[PDB]
From a paper:
Here we describe a data-driven process for the high-speed, automated creation of stable protein designs. We describe a computationally efficient neural network, the Evaluator Model (EM), that is able to predict protein stability with high accuracy, based solely on amino acid sequence. We describe another neural network, the Generator Model (GM), that is able to create novel stable protein sequences at high speed; these sequences can also be successfully refined by the EM. Finally, we demonstrate via low-resolution methods that selected examples fold into stable structures, and report a high resolution crystal structure of one design that matches the expected topology.
Author numbering: 1 to 62
The structure:
């Protein structure tokens, strides 16, 4: 069903947006060395590239 996937994806979008903002606040308080380090933790845990974590964070600032 299309409307149920849309309802589910949008709900997870609102929840995941909260965690991106918290990760942003942790990154905004970190030194440039720690910012790279935090992006490498998230990438190594989630199984993505460190650059993808930054592109995902970019899409949740607007």
């Amino acid at each position: 069903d299309e409307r149920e996937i849309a309802r589910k994806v949008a709900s997870e979008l609102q929840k995941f947006s909260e965690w991106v903002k918290k990760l942003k606040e942790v990154i905004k308080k970190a030194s440039p060395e720690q910012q790279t380090k935090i992006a490498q933790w998230v990438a190594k845990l989630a199984g993505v590239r460190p650059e993808d974590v930054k592109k995902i964070i970019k899409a949740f600032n607007d």
